[PDB]
Amino acid sequence: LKRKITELCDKYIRGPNIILAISAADTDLANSTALQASRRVDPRGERTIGVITKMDLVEPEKGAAILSDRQYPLKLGYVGVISK
């Protein structure tokens, strides 16, 4: 079931589509599957952009930690935004 869903996701991400990964601020970056699979199919991080969501409930220090990181840099950068 879950394995089947992942299988589709993997197939789709593989080919050179511009992949849009999102990440909740509550979950740690390494922890989230979205960015982890984005790094799985794209090691250079050249064709994937990141969005950090649910960012209203964190310190600005926290935003700086997340919006700008060096642990996992990519072209096109990350974009933090609160949607709701």
UniProtKB/Swiss-Prot annotation:
UniProt: GTP binding residues: K54, D56, S83
Recorded superkingdom: Eukaryota
Localization of this protein: Mitochondrion intermembrane space
Region described as G4 motif: spans on this chain: 53-56
Region annotated G5 motif, chain positions: 82-84
Job of this protein: Constitutes the soluble short form (S-MGM1) generated by cleavage by PCP1, which plays a central role in mitochondrial inner membrane fusion and cristae morphology. The transmembrane long form (L-MGM1) and the S-MGM1 form higher-order helical assemblies that coordinate the fusion of mitochondrial inner membranes. Inner membrane-anchored L-MGM1 molecules initiate membrane remodeling by recruiting soluble S-MGM1 to rapidly polymerize into a flexible cylindrical scaffold encaging the mitochondrial inner membrane.
Protein name, entry field: Dynamin-like GTPase MGM1, small form
Source species: Chaetomium thermophilum (strain DSM 1495 / CBS 144.50 / IMI 039719)
Gene: MGM1
